[PDB]
Design a protein around this ligand. Structure first.
Ligand SMILES: CCCCCCCCCCCCCCCCCC(=O)OC[C@H](CO[C@@H]1O[C@H](CO[C@H]2O[C@H](CO)[C@H](O)[C@H](O)[C@H]2O)[C@H](O)[C@H](O)[C@H]1O)OC(=O)CCCCCCCCCCCCCCCCC
Ligand code: CLA
Ligand code: CLA
Ligand code: CLA
Ligand code: CLA
Ligand code: CLA
Ligand SMILES: CCCCCCCCCCCCCCCC(=O)OC[C@H](CO[C@@H]1O[C@H](CS(=O)(=O)O)[C@@H](O)[C@H](O)[C@H]1O)OC(=O)CCCCCCCCCCCCCCC
Ligand SMILES: CC1=C(/C=C/C(C)=C/C=C/C(C)=C/C=C/C=C(C)/C=C/C=C(C)/C=C/C2=C(C)CCCC2(C)C)C(C)(C)CCC1
Ligand SMILES: CC1=C(/C=C/C(C)=C/C=C/C(C)=C/C=C/C=C(C)/C=C/C=C(C)/C=C/C2=C(C)CCCC2(C)C)C(C)(C)CCC1
Ligand SMILES: CC1=C(/C=C/C(C)=C/C=C/C(C)=C/C=C/C=C(C)/C=C/C=C(C)/C=C/C2=C(C)CCCC2(C)C)C(C)(C)CCC1
Ligand SMILES: CC1=C(/C=C/C(C)=C/C=C/C(C)=C/C=C/C=C(C)/C=C/C=C(C)/C=C/C2=C(C)CCCC2(C)C)C(C)(C)CCC1
Ligand SMILES: CCCCCCCS[C@@H]1O[C@H](CO)[C@@H](O)[C@H](O)[C@H]1O
Ligand code: OEX
Ligand SMILES: [Ca+2]
Ligand SMILES: [Ca+2]
Ligand SMILES: [Cl-]
Ligand SMILES: [Cl-]
Ligand SMILES: [Fe+2]
Ligand SMILES: [Mg+2]
Lengths: 37, 38, 30, 81, 30, 341, 34, 451, 334, 29
């Protein structure tokens, strides 16, 4: 477990490792926004 | 109303996120309730 | 069976709604 | 083209979403309730978790007679008291 | 006889590889 | 220009989804087979036919849901909703496995519908009907596996059930009981499918790697025009490459593409013939010489005898739950087992 | 300039309507407990 | 918007990063941002692991892959690999996560704000791919950096607490390495060993002195080499051997990483020295051996003479000979006799497993360890149902060795594929036919027919 | 020119009936050695103790096998992953008893086939072609590696490598299903999508091009004579083929672009088979198929079987019967 | 279990939000 002080951020911590994946998806959002030119 | 008013990329992004959400829910169900083996 | 009405109330409310919204164009088409 | 309106046009039109932001959730909720009210079980004859076996039974209610199969299933269901 | 048959069919096939490759009808451009 | 011809006019309109006369058979039957499969796998049990849960409603996932075959006691009943078994009761009909025959039959007629569609569109567009002809292999496979095979056996029960894991079970059953991998018709099937895959791969890759430079782009897809007269890749270079690599090469494009039709279509047809044999338990199960030698000589061992031991395990360990109507009780002491396991 | 209720429209909806209903159901099922 | 569509760049959106090949600034951006992604996952994943960490459960029962890496370095653990303080894990995580913000900042800056090309801005940071001198210089810088890293490992091991030593006398423990192996005969000796059974090439390194000395050597070699490549330019034979272009260099590095990925797969699958079983769980060999040990112990307790017990095949039920005569565990695990582990080695004599030691010297901790490892063998399903494929649901377990080995085999494979792709393409582009065959100058048409 | 220069020119010559090349310089002797050893062994090798329990399995024709049952038998479990070349044996008789031929053949073959891939790159380079045919070939090659090398490494013995024979192949498959539930593994499922799909698209493409052949012949001659090798004109009307297929489904489901289409034809089976190879290669380290054994449970706690549980019973049969004298302890841990 | 979903909603929107803001402000996408 995290030190007690940080425990309130447990949900956030559970979600962080997936963020890199989001970047991949972001690349596509971005491309769709410029029409895949 | 007129077509093209809502950007196709927004529609695609939102639709896609919706799919990820519902599929996410189904995988959640693999671990809870019926079919969880528990 | 009340369950079939509680369940198929959304479907018929949807059908009624879209019928309401598309009625003029439908009449124009027909 | 074949005369129909392009899908790109339709799904990016405001009216389409006025219609379907109602009709899609309505359908979704309808199916949801089809399950949550338990109606699905009764329409399709699917056992609830407490209706596969009577309390001390451990024998599958296998249908074994072709022409009185219906009655066999009915008997099996009565056997759950 | 069985072994002889198996090995014979195999041998004919290898011979066939040889002719199909080195004694093929040459492709010709028109 | 009477009503028949007016109807023909409308059926053959160039719309987004072509209808045709064949559409009248195809669309309802395909729709009912797909819908039946989705309905069944979402909501319907197999408790009363197999002693199995098989729906999302019961807790199964995509891999384990199925629309399962009827009980063995139903024999080969058409199992119509209005038939003497269900007698018009939709719920009982579902419980008795009515959806299985519903899906298999609407599916069969749907496949007829689709192939008719292929003929009709080919005729309307002015092409040769080789696509329909090729579709005869899917037909042969469906009809031999889902109709002929169970019709040869005791009942619809031993047909494949419509589901992922259910099909996997069908495979394992065929290994254990029929020694299906030993069958030369299945082997020809495998040669046709793997050979088909090989041709798909090698042809696609060859075309893509003998392309003429027909544009300035480093991404070369745009440098093609459907209306262009010229071959888009070099057949001569392709021919020399494969001649020097493999020893032989296509030189004739027409033959190449006919061959691509021929291999997988023929493979599937052969597999069909094998399954028609398995309908009667007419198996390629054993090699008699092998068995005579092995029976007399306890040191004689081959991979064939090894696999039969595996089959015997499969049969003994799967039969009681897989065939519940037989009421098999195999005491522990009779179960075949090697040391320790 | 374009029609609304076409053969395509029908086809589309014969698939899409049941699909959304079904997805609602399967969603509900994820919260069923034995 | 320079070079950001197919018409101007020549590359479609799905090959969009190929538009970056001669835009050194933006490319710098892409790389620093990606490094940011890597560091980000390191930190975030560590914090995730730590939040989910129950200290009195084995790490390998908890789906951990990073905390084991930290613990192997000596941080946070005591005798037997028991977690005595999680705070170092916390630090490693937090610091990586904080650093990823910096890297991402620089990456986003260089990628969409800074100079798109660096050559007009700076002769130091600018580069032409065809400039062999500059390329070998940058290569040199990074070699020096790598050497420094290896030396950081050395320094951790020798001057800042040491490393976790599963082989430590009296039981696994954190130990300061004071006499690293410097003898090149040993160090490169590993490099010349067969990769096959009972040899295992560099994967067989089985003591921390050899590991540390190896990193001393590698550090000096990398720094020297780096200076070398800063100060020199490729020789003629090199010039004539290679393709000199961005895509070519990428292809070379892809080949390298494919190789390293395969090597790492084998490392985590077989080695229990730099991947201590305390943290990663037993190896496959180890668990199989442990089963043999376990039932030898059970049956011998029951009165069995395990040395003379003839099995059904005629081979020893518990004990048999290897093809060179050593006494080894019987049953299928005969394949795994090259296994070596701190819990088994006390039973080993000069001729292999010692019957007297087996009869009189087996300790309770050995029974325990063998039982633990036998019952945590690296077998399990994709949805993490522990055990053989026929096991019922109950135990939530897949070994970290399985996760790491499978992941890195997949990645190494696709990186080999990537190497073939980009090497072939680099060749074709350098020769100038990557876009297809010139119709008016089709090479085969100028060649004599084959027949 | 000097002798070495001449030699290089010949090796890399574009005019040899079969291209040699530098990869070919390794390929030719290794493939020859693998081939020769394989043929001799398949005909005449004595029984081999595959599972290291002095229970020799007969693979060759002269020792009681036919084409279907015969095999070159994997090396002994006693060897494990040890390198066992001919010169490690005390004699050819020992060598044969312990399955030496298997190791000689698969190592020479894996090297030779790798060089075959390289050689495909090389000739593509000499002919002025684009280079990626070899990438397509990497898929069957990777599969070969998976079953002859990687799976043995993971399991700790070449005795678990795929046998070089038909029935032996089936043996490998069934034991694999027992020990990994490969049918429930998504990479194998992708592999099936790869070869079923490859077959589908093979037939589909074949039939579509054949359907739109431009008329160039009479009814008493083969339509194939309507195409002449090296003609510049395409031999079929792709607009007509697309008109057809686009109408068969709907228009935007069909390829109008031949390059795009052929790329698809290459990519689908290649990627699928890549995943098949990776499936074998990762089940090599015992990350197995989905296990839903007893996943569905009723309100009391009674197990409600699904088709997964029936699969499990079949697998149990395979598991308990395979290598019936080799296991002494209750868990099959490799 | 609410906060996890809230967080991933905020992060998950943070991505598309940048694109949207820039598209609106006619920025250098
Ligand atoms: C430029 C490149 C040119 C290459 C040209 C060819 C040269 C030869 C290549 C050999 C290829 C593989 C041979 C066998 C590999 C193997 O058995 O690998 C295993 C070895 C490790 O060996 C094991 O190493 C172990 C060491 O552990 C020992 O030491 C440990 C210390 O903790 C423990 O105590 C442990 O218990 C103890 O046993 C033991 O010795 C085992 O007996 C031993 O089998 O890995 C290793 O050495 C190193 C890892 C090798 C990489 C694995 C090969 C992957 C190739 C995939 C290619 C796919 C291609 C697709 C194309 C399309
Ligand atoms: C790790 C993955 C990665 C990285 C680092 C990059 C990086 C890059 N890409 Mg590539 N790309 C990728 C994956 C990636 N790409 C993928 C998966 C695809 C297929 C979808 C592409 C397809 C593609 C094409 C077709 C093109 C690029 C281009 C580029 C470059 C310019 C981008 C630009 O100007 O857009 C402008 C974008 C915006 C203005 C929107 C905002 C973008 C920023 C970076 C978002 C940052 C979010 C982050 C959380 C902020 C943290 C802040 C904090 C640190 C304070 C840039 C160096 C272009 C190029 O090469 O130009 C020369 C180009 O044309 N990419
Ligand atoms: C350091 C590693 C590395 C680098 C820097 C590059 C760089 C490049 N590659 Mg190469 N490549 C690599 C490894 C690498 N590659 C590997 C390992 C493979 C084997 C698969 C390839 C196979 C390959 C091909 C076939 C091609 C390239 C191309 C390129 C160029 C354009 C890339 C692009 O814009 O894609 C944009 C990115 C995308 C479109 C994203 C693809 C989506 C992937 C497949 C998703 C993977 C799934 C994910 C891991 C898990 C699921 C996540 C999901 C659920 C969210 C660029 C120079 C192109 C080229 O030739 O340019 C000259 C090209 O055609 N690469
Ligand atoms: C080196 C890579 C690696 C390895 C070995 C692991 C291993 C593990 N992770 Mg970690 N993790 C990783 C990367 C890795 N992860 C990444 C990139 C993320 C961000 C997404 C995470 C975030 C994460 C979380 C949040 C959790 C884990 C957990 C775990 C454990 C359970 C894994 C599981 O059930 O997977 C399930 C298996 C899959 C989902 C299958 C993935 C198959 C991929 C998609 C195939 C890709 C093929 C190829 C790349 C595609 C190329 C395309 C081709 C055409 C070229 C296991 C120890 C769990 C745990 O127990 O933590 C304590 C957990 O909760 N991981
Ligand atoms: C790592 C690769 C890398 C490279 C090659 C560059 C190169 C460059 N940067 Mg960039 N940048 C980077 C990363 C990098 N940066 C990072 C991580 C950030 C976030 C802080 C930035 C943010 C940034 C900004 C805001 C600007 C630049 C600018 C520049 C240019 C001027 C450099 C200079 O004169 O500094 C002079 C050198 C020094 C003052 C000495 C630096 C002392 C270092 C940082 C101590 C630490 C060294 C140690 C090895 C760090 C290890 C980190 C590692 C563990 C991850 C040059 C092209 C400028 C530019 O492009 O102008 C147009 C500019 O304005 N960079
Ligand atoms: C990132 C690491 C790296 C890279 C990419 C390079 C790259 C290069 N080096 Mg450099 N070098 C490095 C690190 C590196 N070096 C280090 C650390 C040192 C100090 C040891 C050197 C010392 C050095 C010298 C003295 C020279 C180079 C040279 C070169 C250039 C040609 C090399 C070549 O043809 O290799 C290909 C390798 C060969 C041709 C070797 C023979 C081929 C056999 C068959 C390889 C078999 C290996 C086997 C597969 C590996 C398995 C393990 C093995 C131990 C059994 C090339 C630019 C040459 C140059 O041009 O300098 C200006 C040169 O003369 N390097
Ligand atoms: C389960 C019980 C089953 C029992 C059978 C009961 C149903 C029989 C099967 C009916 C299947 C098809 C019905 C829908 C046909 C249709 O949408 O035509 C659309 C037509 C014409 O629209 C026109 O459509 C034309 C486009 S197109 O024809 O759709 O392509 C366009 O040219 C024109 O401008 C536009 O006005 O409008 C109608 O009048 C529909 C009548 C009601 C149906
Ligand atoms: C039977 C019957 C019938 C019929 C009915 C019907 C016709 C129905 C239909 C139904 C339907 C029609 C349904 C549907 C459904 C759907 C669904 C349920 C879906 C889902 C999906 C998903 C889940 C997705 C997934 C995915 C994929 C696929 C890929 C991509 C990714 C993802 C993952 C997203 C009648 C009455 C006549 C009579 C009686 C009997
Ligand atoms: C270029 C480009 C791209 C990419 C990008 C990227 C890749 C980026 C990255 C970025 C990054 C990489 C970022 C990062 C960030 C980070 C951060 C921002 C962090 C923060 C942190 C914090 C705040 C912490 C906190 C804490 C503490 C301190 C303690 C413990 C707990 C906690 C965790 C709470 C794309 C593809 C889109 C496209 C366009 C171009
Ligand atoms: C740390 C450590 C250690 C050590 C290590 C070492 C010391 C290493 C080294 C290593 C090395 C020392 C490596 C090397 C490598 C190399 C390579 C990998 C090579 C490559 C090459 C190539 C690739 C080439 C190619 C070619 C050819 C062949 C022909 C001509 C052309 C070309 C050039 C392309 C030990 C184990 C003790 C322990 C553990 C820790
Ligand atoms: C560490 C940390 C942090 C950081 C964060 C971050 C760094 C974030 C980022 C984020 C992001 C970066 C996000 C993104 C997202 C994305 C998305 C959500 C996307 C999606 C997509 C999709 C859905 C797609 C779709 C599509 C299209 C568009 C087209 C094509 C088709 C498809 C359908 C595929 C904070 C601040 C919290 C603080 C604490 C700690
Ligand atoms: C089934 C086809 C039967 C066609 S019926 C046909 O239809 C015509 C009008 O369409 C009539 O004029 C004619 O008398 C009648 O025989
Ligand atoms: O060797 Mn061929 O098979 Ca792979 O598991 Mn263990 O070991 Mn044997 O038993 Mn099951
Ligand atoms: Ca309950
Ligand atoms: Ca230099
Ligand atoms: Cl066996
Ligand atoms: Cl054993
Ligand atoms: Fe073609
Ligand atoms: Mg559930």
């Amino acid at each position: 477990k995290l030190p007690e002080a940080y425990a309130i951020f447990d949900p956030l911590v559970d979600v962080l490792p997936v963020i890199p994946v989001l970047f991949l998806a972001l690349a596509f959002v971005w491309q769709a926004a410029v029409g895949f030119r | 109303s007129e077509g093209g008013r809502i950007p196709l990329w927004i529609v695609a992004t939102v639709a896609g996120m919706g799919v990820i959400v519902i599929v996410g829910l189904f995988f959640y169900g693999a671990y809870a309730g019926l079919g969880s083996s528990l | 069976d009340w369950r079939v009405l509680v369940v198929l109330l959304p479907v018929l409310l949807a059908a009624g709604w879209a019928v309401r919204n598309i009625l003029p164009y439908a009449v124009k088409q027909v | 083209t074949t005369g129909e309106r392009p899908f790109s046009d339709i799904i990016t039109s405001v009216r389409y979403w006025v219609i379907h932001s109602i009709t899609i959730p309505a359908l979704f909720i309808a199916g949801w309730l089809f399950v949550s009210t338990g109606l699905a079980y009764d329409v399709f004859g699917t056992p609830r978790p407490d209706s596969y076996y009577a309390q001390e039974q451990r024998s599958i209610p296998l249908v074994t007679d072709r022409f009185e199969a219906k009655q066999q299933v009915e008997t099996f269901l009565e056997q759950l008291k | 006889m069985e072994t002889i048959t198996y090995v014979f069919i195999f041998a004919c096939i290898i011979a066939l590889f040889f002719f199909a490759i080195f004694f093929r009808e040459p492709p010709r451009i028109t | 220009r009477g009503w028949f011809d007016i109807l023909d006019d409308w059926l053959k309109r160039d719309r987004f989804v072509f209808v045709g006369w064949s559409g009248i058979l195809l669309f309802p039957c395909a729709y009912l087979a797909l819908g039946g499969w989705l309905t069944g796998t979402t909501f319907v049990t197999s408790w009363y036919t197999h002693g199995l849960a098989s729906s999302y409603l019961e807790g199964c996932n995509f891999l384990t849901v199925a629309v399962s075959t009827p009980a063995n006691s139903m024999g080969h009943s058409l199992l119509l909703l209005w038939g003497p078994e269900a007698q018009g009761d939709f719920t009982r009909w579902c419980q008795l496995g009515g959806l299985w025959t519903f899906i298999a039959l609407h599916g069969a007629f749907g496949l007829i519908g689709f192939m008719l569609r292929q003929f009709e569109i080919a005729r309307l567009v002015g092409v040769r009907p080789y696509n329909a002809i090729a579709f005869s292999a899917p037909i042969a496979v469906f009809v031999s596996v889902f109709l002929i095979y169970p019709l040869g056996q005791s009942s619809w029960f031993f047909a494949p059930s419509f589901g992922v894991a259910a099909i996997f079970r069908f495979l394992l059953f065929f290994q254990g009981f029929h020694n299906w991998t030993l069958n030369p018709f299945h082997m020809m099937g495998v040669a046709g499918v793997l050979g088909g895959a090989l041709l798909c791969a090698i042809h696609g890759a060859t075309v893509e790697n003998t392309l003429f430079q027909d544009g300035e782009g480093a991404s070369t897809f745009r440098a093609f025009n459907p209306t262009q007269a010229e071959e888009t890749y070099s057949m001569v270079t392709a021919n020399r490459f494969w001649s020097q690599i493999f020893g032989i090469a296509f030189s004739n494009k027409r033959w190449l593409h006919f061959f691509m039709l021929f291999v997988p279509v023929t493979g599937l047809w052969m597999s069909a013939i094998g399954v028609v044999g398995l309908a009667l338990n007419l198996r390629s199960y054993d090699f008699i010489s092998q068995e005579i030698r092995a029976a007399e000589d306890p040191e004689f061992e081959t991979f064939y005898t090894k696999n039969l031991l595996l089959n015997e395990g499969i049969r003994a360990w799967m039969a009681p739950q897989d065939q519940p109507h037989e009421n098999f009780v195999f005491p522990e002491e009779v179960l075949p087992r090697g040391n320790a396991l | 300039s374009y029609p609304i209720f076409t053969v395509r429209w029908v086809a589309v909806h014969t698939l899409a309507v049941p699909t959304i209903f079904f997805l609602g159901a399967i969603a509900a099922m994820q919260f069923i407990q034995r | 918007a320079t070079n950001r569509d197919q018409e101007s760049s020549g590359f479609a959106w799905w090959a969009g990063n190929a538009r970056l090949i001669n835009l050194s600034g933006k490319l710098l951006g892409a790389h620093v941002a990606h490094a940011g992604l890597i560091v980000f996952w390191a930190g975030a994943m560590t914090l995730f692991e730590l939040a989910h960490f129950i200290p009195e459960k084995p790490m390998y029962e908890q789906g951990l892959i990073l905390i084991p890496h930290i613990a192997t370095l000596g941080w946070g653990v005591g005798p037997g690999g028991e977690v005595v303080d999680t705070f170092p894990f916390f630090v490693v995580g937090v610091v990586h996560l904080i650093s990823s913000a910096v890297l991402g900042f620089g990456g986003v800056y260089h990628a969409i704000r800074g100079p798109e090309t660096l050559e007009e801005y700076s002769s130091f940071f600018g580069y032409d791919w065809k400039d062999k001198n500059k390329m070998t210089t940058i290569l040199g810088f990074h070699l020096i950096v790598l050497g420094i890293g290896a030396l950081l490992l050395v320094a951790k091991a020798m001057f800042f607490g040491g490393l976790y030593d599963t082989w430590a006398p009296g039981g696994g423990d954190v130990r300061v390495i004071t006499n690293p192996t410097l003898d090149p005969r040993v160090i490169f000796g590993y490099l010349l060993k067969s990769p096959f059974g009972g040899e295992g090439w560099i994967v067989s390194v089985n003591n921390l002195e050899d590991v540390v000395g190896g990193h001393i050597w590698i550090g000096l070699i990398c720094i020297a080499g780096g200076i070398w490549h800063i100060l020199t330019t490729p020789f003629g034979w090199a010039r004539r051997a290679f393709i000199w272009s961005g895509e070519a260099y990428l292809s070379y590095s892809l080949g390298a990483l494919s190789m390293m990925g395969f090597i790492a797969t084998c490392f985590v699958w077989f080695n229990n020295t730099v991947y201590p079983s305390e943290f990663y769980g037993p190896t496959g060999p180890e668990a199989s051996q442990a089963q043999a040990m376990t039932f030898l112990i059970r049956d011998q307790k029951l009165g069995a003479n395990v040395g003379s017990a003839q099995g059904p095949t005629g081979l020893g039920k518990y004990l048999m000979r290897s093809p060179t005569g050593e006494i080894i565990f019987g049953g299928e695990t005969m394949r795994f006799w090259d296994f070596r582990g701190p819990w088994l080695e006390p039973l080993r004599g000069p001729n292999g497993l010692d019957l007297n030691k087996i009869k009189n010297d087996i300790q309770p901790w050995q029974e325990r360890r063998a039982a633990e490892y036998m019952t945590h063998a690296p077998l399990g399903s994709l949805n993490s149902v522990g055990g053989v494929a026929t096991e019922i649901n109950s135990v939530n377990f897949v070994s970290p060795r399985s996760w790491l080995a499978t992941s890195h085999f997949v990645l190494a494979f696709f990186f080999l594929v990537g190497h073939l792709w980009h090497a072939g393409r680099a060749r074709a582009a350098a020769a100038g036919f990557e876009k297809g065959i010139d119709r008016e100058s089709e090479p085969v048409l100028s060649m004599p027919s084959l027949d | 020119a000097n002798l070495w220069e001449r030699f290089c020119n010949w090796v890399t010559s574009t005019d040899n009936r079969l291209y040699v090349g530098w990869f070919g310089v390794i390929m030719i002797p290794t493939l020859l050695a693998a081939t020769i050893c394989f043929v001799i062994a398949f005909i005449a090798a004595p029984p081999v103790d595959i599972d290291g329990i002095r229970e020799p399995v007969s693979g060759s024709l002269l020792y009681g096998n036919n084409i279907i049952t015969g095999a070159v038998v994997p090396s002994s479990n006693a060897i494990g992953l040890h390198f066992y070349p001919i010169w490690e044996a005390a004699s050819l008789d020992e060598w044969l008893y312990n399955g030496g031929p298997y190791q000689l053949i698969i190592f020479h073959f894996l090297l030779g086939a790798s060089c075959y891939m390289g050689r495909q790159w090389e000739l593509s380079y000499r002919l002025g072609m684009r280079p990626w045919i070899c990438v397509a070939y990497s898929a069957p090659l990777a599969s070969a590696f998976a079953v002859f090398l990687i799976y043995p490494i993971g399991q700790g013995s070449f005795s678990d490598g795929m046998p070089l024979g038909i029935s032996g192949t089936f043996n490998f498959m069934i034991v694999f299903q027992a020990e990994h539930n490969i049918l429930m593994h998504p990479f194998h499922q992708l592999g099936v999508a790869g070869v079923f799909g490859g077959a589908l698209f093979c037939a589909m493409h074949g039939s579509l091009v054949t359907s739109s052949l431009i008329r160039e012949t009479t009814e008493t001659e083969s339509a194939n004579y309507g195409y002449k090798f090296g003609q510049e004109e395409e031999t079929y009307n792709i607009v007509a083929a697309h008109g057809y297929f686009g109408r068969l489904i709907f228009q935007y489901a069909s390829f109008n672009n031949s390059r795009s289409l052929h790329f698809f034809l290459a990519a689908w089976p290649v990627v699928g088979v890549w995943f098949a190879a990776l499936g074998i290669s990762t089940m090599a380290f015992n990350l197995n198929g989905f296990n839903f054994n007893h996943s569905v449970i009723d309100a009391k706690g009674n197990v409600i079987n699904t088709w997964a549980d029936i699969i499990n019973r079949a697998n149990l049969g395979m598991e308990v019967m395979h290598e019936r004298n080799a296991h002494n302890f209750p868990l099959d841990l490799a | 279990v609410i906060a996890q979903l809230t967080m991933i909603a905020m992060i998950g929107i943070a991505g598309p939000m940048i694109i949207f803001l820039l598209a609106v402000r006619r920025g250098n996408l």
